[PDB]
Write a protein that binds this ligand. Structure first.
Ligand code: VD9
Ligand code: VD9
Ligand code: ZN
Length: 257
């Protein structure tokens, strides 16, 4: 099965998921000088006041914090979007070292990690139908740099020891994802894909310019997770990022400057 190793990592994915070589794959390098300021872009509207987290899961690739998406509760709208997108889960990608881990890059800069808040377009009724559509998902991407701790992250960090290995889950209620946002909602946007198999070309990417800071100790705890299941040989969950893919026929637009 696919993963992030030498034998099953990003360069192999195309053999099971040939869309890996498609026309709108993610992530990409954001060349900030060539990104077009678009005065028609609206402010992003992030409405997470009624978000209801339920559980956190080690899926063998990353961990997902899941939300009840059965009502209209935690929604993303505006920005480049038409319509209303409901939060279903967030997860991260991170490195073995502070100098790598993000999926998107900014003028070839890698960040230590990248947060993905995944939302599906309510016009398609549920997530599984949304991923079959070109405007099915909106993923809000936020870079992480190492510096001062992110206090709103610590509840996630502390639960990680209970989901160390593939397939473990733990109740995770009352987690407020507003505590993971930077101060500014200035962003870049472009059309792309899921960054893991099945690599479906269903995502409007919205990547915030301002990173959040997390501490060295917080990222260290991400790196103690394991890609293996309980009772199998330990493989630290590190370097679970896909490298930048060809931009092909796409324009990255900026909401700012
Ligand atoms: C059960 C592991 C078989 S080896 C292998 C299987 C699948 C992949 S893929 N194309 O990355 O999904 C890569 C390596
Ligand atoms: C369709 C099953 C995969 S769900 C899924 C896979 C990848 C992402 S990502 N890393 O945000 O593009 C978001 C959701
Ligand atoms: Zn992701």
């Amino acid at each position: 099965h696919w993963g992030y190793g030498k034998h099953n990592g990003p360069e192999h994915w195309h053999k099971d998921f040939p869309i890996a070589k498609g026309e709108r794959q993610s992530p990409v390098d954001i060349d900030t000088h060539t990104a077009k300021y678009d005065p028609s872009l609206k402010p992003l509207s992030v409405s997470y006041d009624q978000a209801t987290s339920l559980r956190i899961l080690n899926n063998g690739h990353a961990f997902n914090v899941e939300f009840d998406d059965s009502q209209d509760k935690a929604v993303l709208k505006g920005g480049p979007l038409d319509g209303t997108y409901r939060l279903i889960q967030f997860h991260f990608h991170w490195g073995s070292l502070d100098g790598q881990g993000s999926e998107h890059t900014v003028d070839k800069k890698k960040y230590a990690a990248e947060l993905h808040l995944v939302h599906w377009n309510t016009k398609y009724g549920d997530f599984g139908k949304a991923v079959q559509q070109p405007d099915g998902l909106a993923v809000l991407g936020i870079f992480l740099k190492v510096g001062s701790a992110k206090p709103g992250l610590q509840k996630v960090v502390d639960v990680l020891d209970s989901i160390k290995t593939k397939g473990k889950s733990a109740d995770f209620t009352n987690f407020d994802p507003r505590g993971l946002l930077p101060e500014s909602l200035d962003y870049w946007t472009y059309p792309g894909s899921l960054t893991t198999p099945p690599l479906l070309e269903c995502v409007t990417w919205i990547v915030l310019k301002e990173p959040i800071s997390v501490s060295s100790e917080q990222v260290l705890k991400f790196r103690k997770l394991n890609f293996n299941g309980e009772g199998e040989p330990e493989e630290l969950m590190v370097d679970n990022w896909r490298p930048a893919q060809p931009l092909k026929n796409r324009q990255i637009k900026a909401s700012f400057k």
